[model samples]
Target: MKPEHRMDTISKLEEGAETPVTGRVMKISSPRTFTTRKGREGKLANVIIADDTGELRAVFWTENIKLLKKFREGDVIRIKDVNIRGGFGGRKEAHLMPRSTVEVLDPLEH
Candidate 1:
């Protein structure tokens, strides 16, 4: 995704604003799973992210579960096919439809 548009928080999200998102890994929270009405279980992640220009939150779906255990905070992140929830409480949040990406910073690399 384009990193240029993700330079703000949920409060900055505007309606119908199409923008690409990308950034470095500042911090990553632990992974959590949820159950649906059908009893199907899946995992999700709450990623604290920030590009050189700004910072924001990144929410990822079950598809990214396996990728989480491989890394930690402080690494750079790259994401595509993300959805935004629009600006909330003065901060623009990504994933109105519940989507995003996260990457753990390797201590040895960017």
Candidate 2:
């Protein structure tokens, strides 16, 4: 194993920081479920998060229905290939694509 280093507990993911990020789920938008262009149904969940550097958006989507059970608001999550987006009316947000991977983290302590 390698030596441990100081934790970089924050990021500078300002507006337009579209790169992938990891953070705590601070808030969630109402889950959106609907059919796709292929006629296959899907579910989309949106959440807000605060990371070491700043805050961003988190998203969850699943076609199997069961996946939603593993994700929800107030759960810490990690995502790959997620994007930063301009929120409606000019807010910055993390845009979790329907195709990205999502996982709920361990419980948080008050």
Candidate 3:
């Protein structure tokens, strides 16, 4: 899917805004599962992405977690319509919504 808006740098992300971003996967965490207050089951994984400007955490939820299997550390990825939220320690993190789109731009060679 094509991004309708311009891509943004990691350093420019603002809490509560939805933006498109492209960065290299610097780190990734194991998937975790949890239940919401309504008892709905959910899964999530955190990926640290970085451009020249800065690094930001990208949280992949539910179905989006499966998308993370396509790439590994050092791979460049583009995410569209990702929600920027206040993360731990007051840092901004990108959260993938149901409508968000992710694509691998440059895969790191093993």
Name the candidate that leads on TM-score: 3
My TM-score estimates for the predictions, one after another, are 0.60, 0.57, 0.79
**Model 1 ranges off by over 4 Å:** 1-19, 96-110
Comparing 1 with 2 on lDDT, the higher-scoring candidate is 2
**Candidates' lDDT values, in order?**
0.56, 0.58, 0.79
What lDDT tens digits, residue by residue, belong to model 1 across residues 1-110?
A: 44663554334444455544566667777657887565557666777667544676766656666556655576665554566664554334454133544443433344
* Candidate 2 Cα errors over 4 Å, as ranges: 1-11, 14-18, 62-66, 88-91, 105-110
The sequence of per-residue lDDT tens digits that candidate 2 reaches over residues 1-110 is 22233222225444444455667878766667787776666666666777756666555555423445666667787665555655654335555555566666666432
Supply candidate 1's per-residue lDDT for 79: 57
Ranking of models by lDDT: 3, 2, 1
Error of 1 at 54 (Å): 2.3
Better of 1 and 3 by lDDT: 3
Could you tell me the C-alpha RMSD of candidate 1 in Å? 5.3
The residue ranges of model 3 lying beyond 4 angstroms of the native Cα positions read 1-6, 36-41, 88-91, 106-110
